[PDB]
Design a protein around this ligand. Structure first.
Ligand code: HEC
Ligand code: HEC
Ligand code: HEC
Ligand code: HEC
Ligand code: HEC
Ligand code: HEC
Ligand code: HEC
Ligand code: HEC
Lengths: 106, 106
């Protein structure tokens, strides 16, 4: 499909991930009310799509804004956890925040 | 997915173009502040961004809401001319409205 309904997000090739943190499912359908650029923040209205880890490569420095970990966990509202925390602070229905809740579960 | 930065819109596949109004270019780049669903009104969450004339096929009149002409020229703000006219009425920066301005121009 042009936009797959569910995606499986993994670590890039290289260092195996911690066994409990290696794959996360995300649904584009559940995020239908979130604009593409809210997540695909480098999309400027046309062009094609990459994996986030085509840029968010570094796995060793979890503080680095352009690294792998911060793509998903930064306080930035671009990140999975950052948006969900910001929405929760607004009492808005949103996604999970706990480390083994939802994303890293099941 | 590759969202073309410029598309050339013409008659439905396999059909002959209008002899004077046959092709119109549209820039996704220029429309980057317009949500995808504002035009692709059948897209919901995930799936395909279909060409409009997959559905807007009829050219027997310029009145049928599901036909070709109304996709582009309708009071509806989903249509090219309808959105531009509505935005102009609100004194918002927008696209062209005259029949030979922009869309059906060099
Ligand atoms: C955050 C909630 C997102 C929204 C809103 C949209 N997308 Fe998305 N998309 C997101 C992720 C995290 C992923 C997986 C990327 C990875 O590195 O694993 C995707 C994936 C896609 C893809 C496939 C890219 C690929 O793996 O090659 C496409 C083509 C895509 N997304 C398109 C897209 C569009 C057009 C959106 C708005 C309608 C959109 N996405 C929203 C996260 C999010
Ligand atoms: C390269 C073309 C990139 C792709 C694809 C994705 N990101 Fe990105 N991201 C990139 C850069 C260069 C930067 C720094 C800001 C800038 O534009 O220069 C970022 C930043 C983020 C952030 C902010 C992190 C922080 O400041 O703490 C997040 C949360 C982030 N990126 C997430 C993210 C996701 C989820 C992506 C796939 C959907 C993604 N990025 C793609 C470069 C690139
Ligand atoms: C805001 C800009 C978001 C970003 C970035 C991400 N998510 Fe999200 N998420 C958001 C909303 C508004 C919602 C609620 C949708 C609703 O109306 O119900 C969600 C929800 C989720 C869920 C729960 C879905 C379900 O089945 O109930 C998950 C598991 C989830 N979000 C995951 C997720 C991931 C992995 C993201 C980064 C790739 C991510 N979200 C980004 C808003 C936003
Ligand atoms: C969804 C909103 C998430 C929540 C909540 C948390 N994490 Fe996450 N994490 C998420 C994604 C989309 C990804 C990328 C895909 C993958 O599983 O690798 C990750 C990744 C990690 C990793 C792996 C890092 C690496 O291998 O380099 C770890 C160790 C990790 N996540 C830990 C973690 C912790 C401690 C959390 C609470 C602060 C947490 N995650 C929440 C998405 C989401
Ligand atoms: C109206 C101003 C639009 C906005 C906003 C977006 N798109 Fe669009 N797109 C539009 C048209 C009129 C066309 C040409 C269709 C035709 O019938 O000729 C397109 C085309 C696409 C395509 C390509 C489809 C194909 O050629 O088969 C894609 C993948 C696409 N559009 C995606 C897309 C996305 C993801 C948008 C939001 C970021 C988006 N479009 C906005 C009109 C408009
Ligand atoms: C079939 C899957 C369709 C595609 C692809 C597109 N449109 Fe559509 N359109 C469709 C229907 C069934 C209808 C009627 C209303 C409904 O939702 O049932 C419409 C309507 C419009 C209109 C309104 C016309 C009017 O009432 O005068 C416009 C302006 C319109 N559609 C435009 C449009 C464009 C520009 C598309 C490609 C980007 C497009 N439609 C695709 C069915 C389908
Ligand atoms: C509102 C929901 C729109 C619809 C539907 C379409 N257009 Fe549009 N258009 C819109 C805006 C807000 C703007 C201004 C962008 C800016 O900030 O400058 C425009 C602009 C144009 C232009 C001028 C720019 C250019 O590409 O040369 C053209 C020629 C144009 N729009 C064409 C066009 C066509 C062909 C559409 C239907 C397929 C269409 N627009 C829809 C807002 C909206
Ligand atoms: C962009 C905002 C437009 C303006 C202003 C006008 N038209 Fe248009 N027209 C537009 C598109 C995107 C298309 C589809 C592609 C194509 O060129 O075929 C059209 C099409 C027509 C047609 C052809 C119909 C057919 O069955 O082939 C005609 C005759 C036409 N347009 C006429 C027309 C007139 C009279 C306008 C002023 C009221 C007008 N158009 C404005 C986009 C845009």
């Amino acid at each position: 499909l042009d936009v797959p309904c569910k995606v499986v997000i993994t670590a890039p090739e290289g260092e195996d991930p911690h066994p409990r943190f290696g794959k996360v499912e995300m649904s584009h359908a559940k995020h239908r009310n979130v604009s593409c650029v809210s997540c695909h923040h480098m999309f400027d209205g046309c062009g094609d799509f990459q994996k986030c880890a085509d840029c968010h490569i570094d796995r060793d420095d979890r503080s680095y804004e352009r690294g792998f970990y911060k793509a998903w966990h930064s306080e930035s509202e671009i990140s999975c956890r950052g948006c969900h925390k910001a929405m929760k602070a607004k009492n808005e229905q949103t996604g999970p925040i706990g480390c083994l809740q939802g994303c890293h579960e099941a």
